[PDB]
Design a protein. Structure first.
Ligand code: NA
Lengths: 274, 265
């Protein structure tokens, strides 16, 4: 009536809801990585890299990939950063299998970061677009790479790497049918990682899109996004509700619900909009 | 009645879409020919400097961005190694060169290409894209336009355009106003495009062999294979169908398949 104050409150409830969902995803990720990092089939492959042991290991990772769905790759890299084992998974089809396409990944920052981790420490590099030989993969694939150095008798043997597939995950989590909000994902430095609007994505990397930065678009609301854990602002052309979460990597990840005046107007609505 | 009225509207829609594919084929023929006879390809072949490579890649990138339907434009040498490769991504509109250049000599489209005359434009049947023999995911069915390029009657290699069947079907196969979803079925009986991803490519993906029009509608398939535009209603599904030749010589079948529940608007 009264609609801005009440939409805001709805949107904050949705952000709390969704942050709890990413929290749970994070927990699953830690569990899977830890089981994979300690499996006998991995240790067998490390001791004796036979075609047979490799097959057992790939078969396990493919099963896990089909079961869990959020990993578009699962890899073992050696101490030099060269891929030794590689499973790819495609969520549209549900197909998982091995690849013989194996690259030197040592120039990548996520590898350089993985090296700094303790043996068996599970962490992640910020969300970043996938690449092949330094070239962007298309369609564009933002990924959160789970990194775990693997040791035998406390000697480091390589790195387990899981590419969690941020497009898939935002599709799964960021639209809420009942409350009908589209949550967008905004990086620690203001660029878009996920949105129903594909054109605003990845301004830090695609040069034509450098102007799609929350601080540029909202240059007075941005400081609150950075500082506060959650709040909202009404401009009043847009209602913006925001929150931050830690999603595996140490970088804050911002959750944004951004509604035009026109979208705020429709929200005198009914449950036949199911 | 209803099934019969819906049948006629489907047939109108199929002839509409047939005409769109006909027009697309004409575009393709004309662009391919222009590219095969271009100054910039000519200059690069005669003198493959990086300056000439740059000029060519820039040309092919702007053609990709202009035309939208090619997901790659390549030059392969006579031994089937890629020398020039432009990728295009229609969702972003981004086109650009790749340095990921492969030996494509084991591929059937390449062996087919080798069989063509100099300056002849033909096409290989629709086939999923691969990287070192491994399927590209997301799965990408492609219609490859092939043209051997020569100077002084000596073959220099092959211009290859990857026409991006997923893009094309998402563009042409749904019409909001009649509200029909046209599926593409291969001469094979296997599905090439459909709103239902899970039935696609039953010749290639294991565990999808049962998704063959001949298997699903054994007594309707002969009508489709005959290449005639018509329909059949089996009391549970109405199928309307027509066939076109889209660049290659093989017939491609356009299918509107509606269940009783869909029908039943
Ligand atoms: Na790379």
């Amino acid at each position: 009536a009264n609609n801005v104050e009440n939409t805001a409150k709805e949107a904050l409830h949705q952000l709390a809801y969704t942050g709890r969902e990413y929290n749970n995803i994070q927990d699953q990720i830690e569990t899977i990585s830890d089981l994979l990092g300690h499996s006998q089939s991995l240790y067998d492959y490390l001791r004796e890299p036979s075609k047979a042991n490799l097959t057992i290991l790939e078969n396990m990772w493919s099963s896990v990939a089909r079961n869990q769905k959020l990993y578009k790759q699962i890899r073992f890299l050696d101490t030099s950063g060269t891929e030794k084992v590689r499973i790819k998974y495609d969520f549209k089809t549900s197909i998982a299998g091995p690849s013989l396409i194996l690259r030197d990944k040592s120039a990548r920052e996520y590898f350089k970061y993985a090296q700094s981790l303790d043996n068996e420490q599970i962490s992640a590099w910020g969300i970043e677009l996938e690449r092949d030989k330094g070239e962007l993969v298309y369609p564009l694939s933002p990924s959160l790479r789970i990194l775990m150095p693997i040791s035998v008798n406390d000697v480091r043997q390589g790195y387990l790497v899981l590419n969690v597939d941020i497009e898939y995950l935002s599709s799964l989590l960021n639209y809420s049918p009942v409350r009908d909000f589209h949550i967008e994902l905004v990086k620690h430095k203001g660029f878009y990682i996920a949105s129903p609007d594909e054109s605003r994505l990845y301004g830090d990397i695609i040069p034509e899109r450098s102007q799609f930065n929350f601080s540029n678009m909202y240059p007075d609301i941005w400081p609150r996004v950075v500082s506060e854990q959650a709040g909202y602002s009404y401009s009043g052309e847009h209602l913006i509700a925001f929150s931050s979460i830690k999603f595996v990597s140490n970088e804050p990840l911002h959750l944004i619900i951004d509604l035009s005046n026109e979208q705020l107007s429709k929200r005198a609505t009914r449950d036949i909009n199911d």
